[PDB]
Amino acid sequence: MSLQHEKVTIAPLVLLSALDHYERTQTKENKRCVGVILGDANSSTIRVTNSFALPFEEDEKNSDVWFLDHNYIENMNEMCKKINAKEKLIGWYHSGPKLRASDLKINELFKKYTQNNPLLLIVDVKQQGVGLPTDAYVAIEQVKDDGTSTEKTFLHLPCTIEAEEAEEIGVEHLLRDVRDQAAGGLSIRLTNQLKSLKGLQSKLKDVVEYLDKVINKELPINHTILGKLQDVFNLLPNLGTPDDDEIDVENHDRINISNNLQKALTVKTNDELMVIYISNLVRSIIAFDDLIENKIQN
Template identity: 25%
Template sequence: MGGSTVLHLPSGPAGVIAKLHPTVLFNICDSYIRRNDQQERVIGTLLGSVSTDGTVEIRNSYTVPHNESSDQVAVDIDYHRSMFELHQRVNPKEVVVGWYSTSSGVSGSDALIQDFYAREVTNPVHLTVDTTFSDETASIKAYVSTILSLGERQLAAQFHEIQLDLRLLEAERIGFDLLKKTMVEKLPNDLEGLEQSIGRLQNMIEVVFRYVDDVVEGRIPPDNSIGRYLAETISMVPKIAPEAFDRLFNDSIQDLLLVLYLANLTRTQLALAEKLNTAAQIL
């Protein structure tokens, strides 16, 4: 048994979490739209930071030119390093944390690209974005890799999916929902966006009410972590009388309507001035 060869099957890194900012997602989709006709997908570098607990926060990205076939892939390393140097001048706190590709999953050539980024950063994150939106949902996944070895010989990179959190503000969530649709007749205005936000808030409150009722009636067992989270959320809500809240909300709506009215009035005046200037030049 002393001279036998052992196949090492490493387990995936435990507790690794990737947090994705929506700007990165929009940059990836934009680079996919601007790709060459011959390219099936685009790849690029992910920038961000890594916390002490191993959480990877992805804040920025840029596209890296590449060529690939069924058995080989070539990445423009000089372009990647030049772009990284330029980003370092603007934001020196952002470092390389991994790379992305516009595909529905891991492909055969990803191991070669992963090996390149593994020389740039320890344990790089591989982010995949399905830009086809075939089922009208954005399939976004994150992976890390470990080396599958046979004795002293490294065979391949084994990818493991990790937890991915998409950090969205409410306005960004509305834009993300629009991005998932293949066709959009028009962008929602501020009032429509506010209506969608209030509707989504009502749905979340109803889910919380149902959960609390089920726990009180004994239909489901209580979860202490959820209870603490709900208690912290409620404690953060300021205590405002219903009349004061209605007055504050109505004042905000009136201010919003006034801004919309002034913006439309300014747009109309500019259009009239342009038409009068064009008519004067013709005469």
């Protein structure tokens, strides 16, 4: 259906709902909770506004065996539209941990109800790391050059977060932290430069051990991954370019302004140097007279 799924912006309310509902439907230990996600589409940017739980019973043994009460979904839906009839069914949340190729079948069910391709928004509830606990995937059927007679598949989609005005003010009222994703003062940003290096390193390391497995442990040759790595090597920086010379001109500019400004603060504080010393001279006389006053008092 809708091909339009270029970006996914996600309401923090959705997250919050997915985390809470997980426990009040009382599912634990890899027992999946599937619920509906409501919001707008037929739009480039997809905006997931809100969500609601459905009952979901999943058989322990296999992921091909499961119970879902279809009829419930239609009954819930019509009351919900009365509240807000903008919202439409656009797909389903899956309560993590992590993608399955059994989902492909699951997705298809939801497609009956929906007039757009259902979005599979894996809201991971385990919150591993401080990085976003959303991967988004959409079921797409595409042809592939290998020989495969049409493959059916889940393609990763960029996940970001946006909140409404009403929503945003709720986020800030709740929080009481000092914060450090502020990237504000010299201190936060000092950290932030180091943090980014190591951020990169961890990712880079994962790429590196993954490449070993491809040509040694018979993980498939996924041509897409390799294909993408070429742009990284081609658009890698170079030295002895007249760009490098250009950076040096800029470097001189910024250090230059730094020194004029450094001297300029020295002047301001020194004016204060004088002001504290006037005060101090004055108070020598006051201290002297103070004694004479006390003599009378005694």
